[PDB]
Amino acid sequence: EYIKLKVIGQDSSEIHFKVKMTTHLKKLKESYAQRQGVPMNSLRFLFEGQRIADNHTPKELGMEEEDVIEVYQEQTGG
Amino acid sequence: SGEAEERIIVLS
């Protein structure tokens, strides 16, 4: 019962993540930052423009298969 | 440069 989320970076690159509806999104943020080789707190992760918290889950955010997460530099970063 | 390959990470 995974959904696949597409994570889009500042440079238009994509990394997809298969997650459960109950997965704490901290797991995704940490993995993504690791693969980019930057500290996790230098980034902010947005779903439809709203900030994804470590303890948010896809269910709480109303996410579904194929949904996009955008990654921006943290604004006081961070 | 070329198109990146597909990248899927499973968070189990």
Q: How far is CA A13 from CA A2, A7, A36, B3, in A?
A: 22, 8, 10, 10
Retrieve residue A6's tokens: 């597409």
Out of A13, A14, A19, closest to residue B11 by CB: A19
| Number of helices followed by number of strands (H, E) in chain B | 0, 1
Stated in angstroms to one decimal place, the resolution of this structure is: 1.4
Cα distance between residue A34 and residue A62, in whole Å: 26
A1-78: what CATH class? alpha beta
Nearest residue of chain A to residue B4 (CA atoms): A13
CB contact under 8 A, B7 and A15: yes
State the amino acid at position A19 in one-letter form. Answer: V
Chain breaks in chain A (C to N over 2.5 A) after: none
Residue B1 CB partners (closer than 8 Å, separation 6+): none
